[PDB]
């Protein structure tokens, strides 16, 4: 059983529906609509400059996307202008859009593994109420609530926690659209909602998508879209993860650091893109990623559980034959890392990740057996699985964390 083979090539790009690590937001403290929320969010910032490309899109047409931001800046200007901001804009239908809207191997890169570690960190802020997991319609029993407040406690503040609600937010947004505008290049911003340590809700500007027309009469007819992401990541320290982009200079911003204030270039991120009816309903069922992994932590609580005959809850989550540490070195950065699994395993959903699933999970309890039990043929699974290591970044990432579980 030799570890699995990984394609050579140049490496990977982000495949992502939205910037993940290098986003950033445009914020205000709260006192509904999203239209005025990301005008208040723009006014902000005081650090707009002309743009231009500072790392362009090898295959599309750089003028274009440029022209779509300048834009989306002419039309909000011209809604600051109007006695009362319209609910919705949308944008006019400029050759620059028209075109923007549509009217091989690769190998593994070391982003897609610093992009997972930062999924499993905390954030300054809560991204989820109490009670946001689960859908019971009756009163849970008393276990099933502390487990769910232990875990809603260790996850409410992770990174991977933002990317759901921000996915479920931006889903729901286009998919809201897609039947609400058929026609319209709807302007939309993309919008998260979180409350600081402090207590004081915040609402969070990333960006802005465009559509293009949405006659979507079944689940996986194409909606395509024009997405313009704010980001700090300067985007020729690793252009091969930003294949899929043309990527502006639009501002500076002063920032605090660990070195002082300084004054950083602000970026923002374009690409054309597509998504289905299927895929958007699946983004807004991203919550369910807090579901899925509070049930394996749960199982695993059951597991110790039955051995100890008395529920292990407390003893699991406050960490007090038995279990002598963490391997992660915290309970909090177990939850964390299973949610951040179950949360790239949506935003990276695809057939090659399906089928690397289902075919290493049957590799895997076959070389357990054999480690356990040593001090029909292999082949065929091997070429299975790396049948599906072609050049998604999650999969790929994946394969590399199989080959050390078959190394050690
Ligand atoms: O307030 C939104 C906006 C529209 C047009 C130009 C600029 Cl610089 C801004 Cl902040």
């Given at each position: 059983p030799r570890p699995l083979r990984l394609p050579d090539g140049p490496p990977c790009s982000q495949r992502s529906k939205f910037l993940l690590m290098d986003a950033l937001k445009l914020s205000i403290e709260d006192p509904g609509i999203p239209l005025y929320d990301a005008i208040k969010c723009m006014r902000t910032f005081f650090g707009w400059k002309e743009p231009n490309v500072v790392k362009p899109h090898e295959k599309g047409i750089n003028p274009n996307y440029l022209l779509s931001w300048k834009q989306v800046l002419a039309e909000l200007q011209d809604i600051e202008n109007e006695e009362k901001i319209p609910r919705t804009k949308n944008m006019k239908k400029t050759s620059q859009l028209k075109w923007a809207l549509g009217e091989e191997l690769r190998s593994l890169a070391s982003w897609i593994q610093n992009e997972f570690n930062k999924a499993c960190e905390l954030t300054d802020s809560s991204w989820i109420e109490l009670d946001e997991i689960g859908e019971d319609a009756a009163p849970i029993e008393h276990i099933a609530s502390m487990r769910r407040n232990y875990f809603t406690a260790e996850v409410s503040h992770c990174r991977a926690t933002e990317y759901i609600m921000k996915g479920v937010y931006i889903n729901t947004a286009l998919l809201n659209a897609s039947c609400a505008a058929m026609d319209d290049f709807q302007l939309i911003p993309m919008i998260s909602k979180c409350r600081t340590k402090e207590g004081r809700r915040k609402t969070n500007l990333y960006g802005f998508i465009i559509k293009g027309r949405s006659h979507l009469r079944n689940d996986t007819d194409v909606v395509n879209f024009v997405s313009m992401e704010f980001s700090l990541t300067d985007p020729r320290l690793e252009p091969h993860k930003w294949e899929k982009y043309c990527v502006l200079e639009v501002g500076d911003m002063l920032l605090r650091s660990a070195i002082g204030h300084v004054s950083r270039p602000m970026f923002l991120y374009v690409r054309t893109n597509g998504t289905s009816k299927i895929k958007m309903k699946w983004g807004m069922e991203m919550r369910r990623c807090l579901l899925q992994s509070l049930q394996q932590i749960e199982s695993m609580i059951e597991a110790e559980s039955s051995v100890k005959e008395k529920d292990m809850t407390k003893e699991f989550f406050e960490?007090?034959?038995?279990?002598?540490?963490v391997e992660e070195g915290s309970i909090g950065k177990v939850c964390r890392t299973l949610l951040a699994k179950s949360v790239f395993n949506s935003l990276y959903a695809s057939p090659q990740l399906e089928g690397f699933s289902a075919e290493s999970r049957k590799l895997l309890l076959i070389v357990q057996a054999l480690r356990d039990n040593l001090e029909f043929d292999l082949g065929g699974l091997y070429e299975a699985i790396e049948e599906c290591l072609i050049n998604d970044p999650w999969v790929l990432l994946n394969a590399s964390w199989f080959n050390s579980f078959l190394t050690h």
């Amino acid at each position: 059983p030799r570890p699995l083979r990984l394609p050579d090539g140049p490496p990977c790009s982000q495949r992502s529906k939205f910037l993940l690590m290098d986003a950033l937001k445009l914020s205000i403290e709260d006192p509904g609509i999203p239209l005025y929320d990301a005008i208040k969010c723009m006014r902000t910032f005081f650090g707009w400059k002309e743009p231009n490309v500072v790392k362009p899109h090898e295959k599309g047409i750089n003028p274009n996307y440029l022209l779509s931001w300048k834009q989306v800046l002419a039309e909000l200007q011209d809604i600051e202008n109007e006695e009362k901001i319209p609910r919705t804009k949308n944008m006019k239908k400029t050759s620059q859009l028209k075109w923007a809207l549509g009217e091989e191997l690769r190998s593994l890169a070391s982003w897609i593994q610093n992009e997972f570690n930062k999924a499993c960190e905390l954030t300054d802020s809560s991204w989820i109420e109490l009670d946001e997991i689960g859908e019971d319609a009756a009163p849970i029993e008393h276990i099933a609530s502390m487990r769910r407040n232990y875990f809603t406690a260790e996850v409410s503040h992770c990174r991977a926690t933002e990317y759901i609600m921000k996915g479920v937010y931006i889903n729901t947004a286009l998919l809201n659209a897609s039947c609400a505008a058929m026609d319209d290049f709807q302007l939309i911003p993309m919008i998260s909602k979180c409350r600081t340590k402090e207590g004081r809700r915040k609402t969070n500007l990333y960006g802005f998508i465009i559509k293009g027309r949405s006659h979507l009469r079944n689940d996986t007819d194409v909606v395509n879209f024009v997405s313009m992401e704010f980001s700090l990541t300067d985007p020729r320290l690793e252009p091969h993860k930003w294949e899929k982009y043309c990527v502006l200079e639009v501002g500076d911003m002063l920032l605090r650091s660990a070195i002082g204030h300084v004054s950083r270039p602000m970026f923002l991120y374009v690409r054309t893109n597509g998504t289905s009816k299927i895929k958007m309903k699946w983004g807004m069922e991203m919550r369910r990623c807090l579901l899925q992994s509070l049930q394996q932590i749960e199982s695993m609580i059951e597991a110790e559980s039955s051995v100890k005959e008395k529920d292990m809850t407390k003893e699991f989550f406050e960490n007090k034959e038995s279990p002598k540490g963490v391997e992660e070195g915290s309970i909090g950065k177990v939850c964390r890392t299973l949610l951040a699994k179950s949360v790239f395993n949506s935003l990276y959903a695809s057939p090659q990740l399906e089928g690397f699933s289902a075919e290493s999970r049957k590799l895997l309890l076959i070389v357990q057996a054999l480690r356990d039990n040593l001090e029909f043929d292999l082949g065929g699974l091997y070429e299975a699985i790396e049948e599906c290591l072609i050049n998604d970044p999650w999969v790929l990432l994946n394969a590399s964390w199989f080959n050390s579980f078959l190394t050690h």
